[PDB]
Amino acid sequence: PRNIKAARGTTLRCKGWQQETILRLLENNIENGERPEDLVIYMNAAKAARDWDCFDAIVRTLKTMEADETLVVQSGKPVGLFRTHAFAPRVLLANGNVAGRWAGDANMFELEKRGLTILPGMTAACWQYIGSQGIVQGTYQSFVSAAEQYFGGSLAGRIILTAGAGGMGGAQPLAGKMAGAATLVVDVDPVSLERRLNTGYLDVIATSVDDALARIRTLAAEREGGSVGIVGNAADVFEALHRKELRPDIVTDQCMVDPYRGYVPSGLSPAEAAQLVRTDPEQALALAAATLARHARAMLRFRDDGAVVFEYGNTLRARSVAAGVPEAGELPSFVTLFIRPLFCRGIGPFRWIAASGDPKDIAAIDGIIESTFAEGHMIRQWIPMARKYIQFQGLPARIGWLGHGERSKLALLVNEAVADGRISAPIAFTRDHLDAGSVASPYAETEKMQDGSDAVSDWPLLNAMLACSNGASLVALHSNGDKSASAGQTAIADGTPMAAFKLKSVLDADTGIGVIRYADAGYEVARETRALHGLGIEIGGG
């Protein structure tokens, strides 16, 4: 038992607070991981570092590096330390990037097996994970937008069905509950439900399908929001819930559907599945695809009854198409129905973390927001909700979606609050990679762009390079094999005037490049936002 835990308090182990914050962020990733003794954070096998040896050497370099040197990380392995300057980043990471033609599913698996790459996830290998809370606002925003679009602004009395209680999926049953819906989440692995049940993200774990149906219908009939977990395989349980007439209003899914990493064929356990992939991969893929076709056909069968059925960024439709269900490619997605209007204004999963470990530092910022943004603002209705439902996990932190100009504004107020004692230690500002100007993903975030530019990955590359040029504390470029590319970045509010400058340079360009990206594709709200903030360039013949 390594049992990594982020350091608490205000005593440096590093030569300076930039380094110590990143070290604590690294430790905090592991502390909140789904399988932390394997470095696994989430998405079945996305890791904080390539192995425990690289983890140890990363920790040593953080502790002794100077404020004008920069650590270089190649797929979870520290490979260099360069003398740079004080306004440059302290860490540069590039994880899981493989040239497209050889980044197919099968070869990524082989390269990872041989130790040549890691699967970075989004926030796993760049140390920006804050547990299940980093996901919950986005998923709650989706359920609320769905209630606004299709159910008259209310999920009271409505049924939400979904699967996946993993590191990201586990945020589902709380978001549904916060949204007013009776929410049923299927997971094949009881430990996953047990982890959400104990963390405050699941209300009860049902003992059977019948039991699950009675408890959801009671919530539905009382028109109360609540969460009900079921232990079972989504293929088998989805079909039984249709035979028993659950009649769900909303069906979605956040399973790991990767046959190589996490999708459990019907009849197997998670353990058996992972062993069949190590010893007989071709049978596993045959069994996985067999189970996914039933899984997808069951979701399509709920749609035929009138449920709103969408994908939630896990490649279910495409992988389902590959397994013989071409109708699965005609299902919609959470992005095109709910999130893209937010991205057009640069609104994304902005988050922050108290290196202190003191919950009073988060509550402090919570008061800043309520004194700083107008009532009715998206963020003024989220903070009371987060305060109410969301337990801290590891270093106290907060998810707070904000748009262009608003991120730099809050970050400067927090940097001043640090500078004058209301906050006891530095605040790390970061985000998910799935932000307006930092990801190209044709299966998810950039599906069906107005101008057809789905697969253009120039944008995240520019996002990273801007973050470096602006002085972010840590900058990362990831890939999901041949399907997606994205940029992440961390900027530290430590109280210094140097921090204040970086925070406003970094954050305004972070969202500014997102506004530009969507304006370029033709979205009119983004084009107006770009015109208003001077974000454009005059090009003739237009």
Ligand X SMILES: NC(=O)c1ccc[n+]([C@@H]2O[C@H](COP(=O)([O-])OP(=O)(O)OC[C@H]3O[C@@H](n4cnc5c(N)ncnc54)[C@H](O)[C@@H]3O)[C@@H](O)[C@H]2O)c1
Residues 34-63 that bind a copy of itself (CB under 8 A): 51, 53-54, 56-57, 60-61
Q: Is 312 annotated as a binding residue?
A: yes
- Residue 427 contacts residue 492 (beta carbons within 8 Å): yes
Please choose, from the candidates 368, 492, 473, 366, the residue with its C-alpha nearest in 3D space to the C-alpha of residue 426. Answer: 492
Partner in contact with 70, chosen from a copy of itself, ligand X, none, beta carbon below 5 to 8 Å by kind: a copy of itself
Residue with token string 């099968």: 106
Chain contacts with ligand X (rule: CB under 6 A)? 34, 42-44, 135, 138, 163-169, 186-189, 192, 233-235, 254-256, 262-264, 270, 291, 312-314, 434
Phi and psi torsions of 47, nearest 5°: -120, 155
* Structure tokens given for 409: 């504004």
CA dihedral of residues 97, 102, 107, 113 (deg, nearest 10)? -40
Partner in contact with 101, chosen from a copy of itself, ligand X, none, beta carbon below 5 to 8 Å by kind: a copy of itself
Q: Is 169 annotated as a binding residue?
A: yes
**Nearest residue to ligand X on Cβ basis:** 166
Residues 104-143 that bind a copy of itself (CB under 8 A): 104, 107, 111, 114, 116-117
Q: Does 459 bind a copy of itself (CB under 8 A)?
A: yes
- The β-bridge relationship of strands 474-480 and 91-95 is parallel
Q: Is 168 annotated as a binding residue?
A: yes
> Which of helix, strand or coil describes residue 191?
helix
- Which residue lies nearer to ligand X by CB, 146 or 163? 163
Given CA atoms 388, 390, 396, 400 in this order, what sign does their dihedral have? negative
Q: Is 187 annotated as a binding residue?
A: yes
Residues 328-357 that bind a copy of itself (CB under 8 A): none
Segment interacting with a copy of itself (CB under 8 A) among 5-13, 139-147, 399-407, 510-518: 510-518
CA dihedral of residues 170, 167, 464, 18 (deg, nearest 10)? 110
Q: Is 192 annotated as a binding residue?
A: yes
- Which residue lies nearer to a copy of itself by CB, 54 or 399? 54
> How many whole angstroms separate alpha carbon 47 and alpha carbon 273?
20
User: DSSP state, 158?
Assistant: -
Residue 417 beta carbon to a copy of itself: minimum distance, rounded to whole angstroms: 25
- Residue 343 contacts residue 436 (beta carbons within 8 Å): yes
Partner in contact with 233, chosen from ligand X, a copy of itself, none, beta carbon below 5 to 8 Å by kind: ligand X
Partner in contact with 317, chosen from ligand X, a copy of itself, none, beta carbon below 5 to 8 Å by kind: none
Binding mask 66-105 for a copy of itself (x = CB under 8 A): ----x-x-xx-xxxxxxxxx-xxx--x-xxxxxxxxxxx-
Residues 472-491 that bind a copy of itself (CB under 8 A): 475, 477, 479, 481-485
Binding mask 186-225 for a copy of itself (x = CB under 8 A): ----------------------------------------
Q: Which long-range contacts (CB under 8 A, 24 or more apart) does 443-448 make?
A: 443/313, 443/315, 443/317, 443/318, 443/483, 443/484, 444/311, 444/313, 444/315, 444/333, 444/335, 444/484, 445/313, 445/335, 445/339, 445/343, 447/333, 447/335, 447/336, 448/336
Partner in contact with 539, chosen from ligand X, a copy of itself, none, beta carbon below 5 to 8 Å by kind: a copy of itself
Phi and psi torsions of 309, nearest 5°: -125, 120
Q: Is 234 annotated as a binding residue?
A: yes
Feature table: binding site for NAD(+): 43, 167-169, 187, 192, 233-234, 254, 264, 312
